[PDB]
Amino acid sequence: PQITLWQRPLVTIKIGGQLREALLDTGADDTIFEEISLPGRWKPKIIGGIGGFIKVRQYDQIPIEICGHKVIGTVLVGPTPANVIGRNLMTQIGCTLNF
Amino acid sequence: PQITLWQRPLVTIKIGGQLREALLDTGADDTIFEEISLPGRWKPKIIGGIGGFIKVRQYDQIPIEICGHKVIGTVLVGPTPANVIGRNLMTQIGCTLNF
Ligand SMILES: CC(C)(C)NC(=O)[C@@H]1CN(Cc2cccnc2)CCN1C[C@@H](O)C[C@@H](Cc1ccccc1)C(=O)N[C@H]1c2ccccc2C[C@H]1O
């Protein structure tokens, strides 16, 4: 589908058997979620954004359904103010910017 | 044109007679640059992102040529790790997300 930017580009996602809304965020290299229970091991990771750095855990090979599309990739979990889907996943569902 | 997301969606922009590289950021409501000298009055403003909040200057009605398209809008200038073009300006040039 085509999505204009006159509002935040939100999409509903299923991940870990849980439902959530993420913002399609071409400015984010990675994907991060506020609070969701993910199974298995993880590696610490400290990401930098506007306003500072945050400590988060990294989960790889995580199945995630974005707007009805099925993809798998690394998903971060940490103290973010908004759930974001990054280019690491937006590439998998073939998302592009147009103008 | 059409821009895939396998790399950061950077575009060249001219603002205040200066040249800058900016990130097409669908996840950002506003536009902000690290260090540019814009003329006229501004209004203090505090924005929040992942990792924290930062105090910035808010200049309105600022001409900005994005990827060869001329638009005018609110541009923020503050301590950001990367220049970002937000939806407030993306809508002006008619950018959409596609998949
Ligand atoms: C208006 C303003 C510009 C302050 N908005 C944001 O920063 C929003 C904030 N929300 C949240 C919010 C906060 C307060 C109120 N409402 C909403 C979360 C999403 N961001 C947009 C991000 O796309 C910004 C980029 C900026 C950046 C690029 C390169 C280097 C440093 C900073 C960003 O945060 N990028 C990083 C990033 C982000 C997520 C996951 C991984 C990574 C890595 C990296 O690409």
Curated annotation (Swiss-Prot), chains A, B:
Source superkingdom: Viruses
Positions of the UniProt region annotated as Dimerization of protease: 1-5, 49-55, 88-99
Quaternary organization: Homodimer, whose active site consists of two apposed aspartic acid residues.
Coiled-coil ranges (or none): none
Residues of the active site: 25 (for protease activity)
Designated name of the protein: Protease
Domain annotation Peptidase A2: ranges: 20-89
